[PDB]
Design an enzyme around this catalytic site. Structure first.
Site, PDB file in Angstrom:
ATOM      1  N   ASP A  29       1.042  -1.332  -0.143  1.00  0.00           N
ATOM      2  CA  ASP A  29       0.520  -0.141   0.012  1.00  0.00           C
ATOM      3  C   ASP A  29       0.891   1.207  -0.186  1.00  0.00           C
ATOM      4  O   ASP A  29       1.403   1.519   0.911  1.00  0.00           O
ATOM      5  CB  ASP A  29      -0.686   0.093   1.163  1.00  0.00           C
ATOM      6  CG  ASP A  29      -2.453   0.864   1.042  1.00  0.00           C
ATOM      7  OD1 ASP A  29      -2.208   2.047   0.052  1.00  0.00           O
ATOM      8  OD2 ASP A  29      -2.496   0.866   2.348  1.00  0.00           O
ATOM      9  N   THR A  30       1.155   1.805  -1.028  1.00  0.00           N
ATOM     10  CA  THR A  30       1.803   3.134  -0.837  1.00  0.00           C
ATOM     11  C   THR A  30       0.948   3.939  -0.550  1.00  0.00           C
ATOM     12  O   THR A  30       1.647   5.150  -0.456  1.00  0.00           O
ATOM     13  CB  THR A  30       1.837   3.500  -2.554  1.00  0.00           C
ATOM     14  OG1 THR A  30       1.230   3.687  -3.655  1.00  0.00           O
ATOM     15  CG2 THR A  30       3.270   2.503  -3.596  1.00  0.00           C
ATOM     16  N   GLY A  31      -1.082   4.301  -0.486  1.00  0.00           N
ATOM     17  CA  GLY A  31      -1.015   5.317   0.494  1.00  0.00           C
ATOM     18  C   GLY A  31      -0.931   4.819   2.225  1.00  0.00           C
ATOM     19  O   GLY A  31      -1.699   6.040   2.474  1.00  0.00           O
TER      20      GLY A  31
HETATM   21  C1  4AH Z   1      -1.925   8.997   7.169  1.00  0.00           C
HETATM   22  O1  4AH Z   1      -2.149   8.170   7.912  1.00  0.00           O
HETATM   23  C2  4AH Z   1      -2.171   6.804   6.558  1.00  0.00           C
HETATM   24  O2  4AH Z   1      -0.870   6.302   6.106  1.00  0.00           O
HETATM   25  N1  4AH Z   1      -2.654   5.985   6.524  1.00  0.00           N
HETATM   26  C3  4AH Z   1      -3.183   4.856   6.271  1.00  0.00           C
HETATM   27  C4  4AH Z   1      -3.784   4.501   5.535  1.00  0.00           C
HETATM   28  O3  4AH Z   1      -5.390   4.402   5.793  1.00  0.00           O
HETATM   29  N2  4AH Z   1      -4.352   4.705   4.146  1.00  0.00           N
HETATM   30  N3  4AH Z   1      -4.585   4.747   2.780  1.00  0.00           N
HETATM   31  C5  4AH Z   1      -5.232   6.122   2.886  1.00  0.00           C
HETATM   32  C6  4AH Z   1      -5.199   7.439   3.393  1.00  0.00           C
HETATM   33  C7  4AH Z   1      -3.840   8.533   3.422  1.00  0.00           C
HETATM   34  C8  4AH Z   1      -3.925   9.165   4.275  1.00  0.00           C
HETATM   35  C9  4AH Z   1      -4.363   9.028   5.580  1.00  0.00           C
HETATM   36  C10 4AH Z   1      -4.593  10.358   6.359  1.00  0.00           C
HETATM   37  C11 4AH Z   1      -5.848  10.436   7.460  1.00  0.00           C
HETATM   38  C12 4AH Z   1      -5.837  11.601   8.347  1.00  0.00           C
HETATM   39  C13 4AH Z   1      -4.587  12.608   8.426  1.00  0.00           C
HETATM   40  N4  4AH Z   1      -3.403  12.195   7.257  1.00  0.00           N
HETATM   41  C14 4AH Z   1      -3.556  11.207   6.703  1.00  0.00           C
HETATM   42  C15 4AH Z   1      -5.557   8.056   5.545  1.00  0.00           C
HETATM   43  C16 4AH Z   1      -5.845   7.504   4.741  1.00  0.00           C
HETATM   44  C17 4AH Z   1      -6.003   4.341   2.493  1.00  0.00           C
HETATM   45  C18 4AH Z   1      -6.383   2.369   2.650  1.00  0.00           C
HETATM   46  O4  4AH Z   1      -4.993   2.018   1.315  1.00  0.00           O
HETATM   47  C19 4AH Z   1      -5.583   1.180   3.491  1.00  0.00           C
HETATM   48  C20 4AH Z   1      -6.731   0.199   3.897  1.00  0.00           C
HETATM   49  C21 4AH Z   1      -6.306  -0.662   2.411  1.00  0.00           C
HETATM   50  C22 4AH Z   1      -7.640  -2.191   2.860  1.00  0.00           C
HETATM   51  C23 4AH Z   1      -8.092  -1.973   4.076  1.00  0.00           C
HETATM   52  C24 4AH Z   1      -8.631  -0.835   4.807  1.00  0.00           C
HETATM   53  C25 4AH Z   1      -7.389   0.178   4.426  1.00  0.00           C
HETATM   54  C26 4AH Z   1      -7.568   2.643   2.129  1.00  0.00           C
HETATM   55  O5  4AH Z   1      -8.527   3.088   3.175  1.00  0.00           O
HETATM   56  N5  4AH Z   1      -8.164   1.864   1.225  1.00  0.00           N
HETATM   57  C27 4AH Z   1      -9.715   1.977   0.677  1.00  0.00           C
HETATM   58  C28 4AH Z   1      -9.929   2.236  -0.222  1.00  0.00           C
HETATM   59  C29 4AH Z   1      -9.592   4.127   0.058  1.00  0.00           C
HETATM   60  C30 4AH Z   1     -10.293   5.293  -1.301  1.00  0.00           C
HETATM   61  C31 4AH Z   1     -11.437   4.747  -1.900  1.00  0.00           C
HETATM   62  C32 4AH Z   1     -11.727   2.640  -1.914  1.00  0.00           C
HETATM   63  C33 4AH Z   1     -11.086   1.746  -0.585  1.00  0.00           C
HETATM   64  C34 4AH Z   1     -11.531   0.729  -0.422  1.00  0.00           C
HETATM   65  C35 4AH Z   1      -9.615   0.453  -0.301  1.00  0.00           C
HETATM   66  O6  4AH Z   1      -9.438  -0.405  -0.984  1.00  0.00           O
HETATM   67  C36 4AH Z   1      -2.524   3.351   7.421  1.00  0.00           C
HETATM   68  C37 4AH Z   1      -3.924   3.731   8.416  1.00  0.00           C
HETATM   69  C38 4AH Z   1      -2.778   1.732   6.570  1.00  0.00           C
HETATM   70  C39 4AH Z   1      -1.081   4.226   8.466  1.00  0.00           C
END
Ligand code: 4AH
Lengths: 99, 99
Positions: B25-27
């Site tokens: 997960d690059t995000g």
């Molecule tokens: C820095 O925080 C993070 O890096 N958070 C990470 C995070 O949640 N990352 N990102 C986006 C994302 C990006 C930034 C922020 C965020 C929040 C608050 C302050 N700044 C940034 C939240 C979510 C999202 C992640 O890919 C993580 C994930 C993957 C699988 C299952 C559940 C969750 C995700 O949420 N995927 C889902 C998504 C996103 C957009 C549209 C549809 C869908 C469906 C899913 O594919 C974490 C918690 C793993 C470590």
């Protein structure tokens, strides 16, 4: 281009004639952007992430440029923490993970 | 290897003597795994995603192997719906986004 991951892979996108910063997210199935206005009708969708689900508005066949690469696809709009470019569009621009 | 994004980029990882499936997960800033036991000291942490925040345990200097590539780094353990390999470890295996 080739983007390393030492910092968040934030890039500039263009949608509705406006520039925005978005996160290239291989872990996201869909693309979701912060509240904004988009043309046409929208459909309901629930997307789930780390802390649960959120309701978003689904707009289809929307023009969006990512790092200069043009794409036309589904864009979700809702209370997301940051603009996220998901696999639905990463595939359109020919993006892959390599190591 | 080159991983396409037509499907979720899931790979096998080895950690704490266990084989698990995880999402590249690059995000994701951090790496977070579903509930499991890890050695050493830990500290509480709150991480946020779409949907909000969840509380996890933070373990530092943890050895992990991703697709045969060994790395060391911080691993968070908590109520995540799926195992996520974040940028803190993706950088170590030399993972990049390309298009
Ligand atoms: C820095 O925080 C993070 O890096 N958070 C990470 C995070 O949640 N990352 N990102 C986006 C994302 C990006 C930034 C922020 C965020 C929040 C608050 C302050 N700044 C940034 C939240 C979510 C999202 C992640 O890919 C993580 C994930 C993957 C699988 C299952 C559940 C969750 C995700 O949420 N995927 C889902 C998504 C996103 C957009 C549209 C549809 C869908 C469906 C899913 O594919 C974490 C918690 C793993 C470590």
């Amino acid at each position: 281009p080739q983007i390393t991951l030492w910092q968040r892979p934030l890039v500039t996108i263009k949608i509705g004639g406006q520039l925005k910063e978005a996160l290239l997210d291989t872990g996201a199935d869909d693309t979701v952007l912060e509240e904004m206005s988009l043309p046409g009708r929208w459909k309901p969708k629930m997307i789930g992430g780390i802390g649960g689900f959120i309701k978003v508005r689904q707009y289809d066949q929307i023009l969006i440029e990512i790092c200069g690469h043009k794409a036309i696809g589904t864009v979700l709009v809702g209370p997301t923490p940051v603009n996220i470019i998901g696999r639905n569009l990463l595939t359109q621009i020919g993006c892959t993970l390599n190591f």
